[PDB]
Amino acid sequence: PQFAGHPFGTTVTAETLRNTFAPLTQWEDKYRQLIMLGKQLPALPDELKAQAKEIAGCENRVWLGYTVAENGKMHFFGDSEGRIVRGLLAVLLTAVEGKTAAELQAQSPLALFDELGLRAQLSASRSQGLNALSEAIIAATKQVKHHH
């Protein structure tokens, strides 16, 4: 199934994130907590980078890949060089992950950033890799019509 794994969607849930981010009003503290959240995303090895899509931006390099279980549940994995984007990816992975393609196309992952009160931060880093990751997930979710 997996190697380095990641806790997002399983161990780290929407509830867990909400306890952490809900009481934060000062923008500086929100970024601190995003950076810290990103430390929980492991370093993805070279072999797993080979089977992920590399979205090399001018600003920042980002990786995203997927696998689908017989269940129909999708496992997502990825990485970022930028630490603020790495935290945001972590939030993104919590929203998806272990969810089927039908479930995914019917929910917007962006709703989680609202619940956590992170829209300003998301917005500030969209072109530094978040756009790319989000659309890569949409592209990956569309590929799960095939093999019927």
Partner: peptide, 8 residues
């Protein structure tokens, strides 16, 4: 990382 710095 330089991207992080530019954002802040």
């Amino acid at each position: 990382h330089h991207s992080d710095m530019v954002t802040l």
